Amino acid sequence: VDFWPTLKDAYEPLYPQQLEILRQQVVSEGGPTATIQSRFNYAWGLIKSTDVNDERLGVKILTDIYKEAESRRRECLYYLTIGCYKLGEYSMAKRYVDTLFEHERNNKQVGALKSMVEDKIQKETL
């Protein structure tokens, strides 16, 4: 319990003081030079945020991690999907989740995500 968050978890913001804690952790490690973990943590709280610029910053931090940590790349595709989805970029979200789905046809979390993305795409076009 449990490998990824739910899309629902993605829509529950942290309390401001929780987000600030995650920010101060990255500050304490030098910002750009912070650990992958501490940066992911802050990025995930930013993705959860109802502020569009926070969400963009979270996605940006996640693409950094994707670029720099090959071992983390499959894992980051899941977050990049949710990020783009919250941002209205469903074409990008479909792309990411398709890659990820090619590596896990049997994972129920991914198929749940994939389904949401394609339901949204369906609904919006139309």
Partner: peptide, 20 residues
């Protein structure tokens, strides 16, 4: 390897414990 999300779920309860 233990997930990023798993590391995140560990971090915040402990950080909040540290607050005074």
């Amino acid at each position: 390897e233990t997930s990023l999300f798993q590391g995140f779920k560990s971090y915040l309860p402990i950080a909040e414990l540290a607050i005074e």
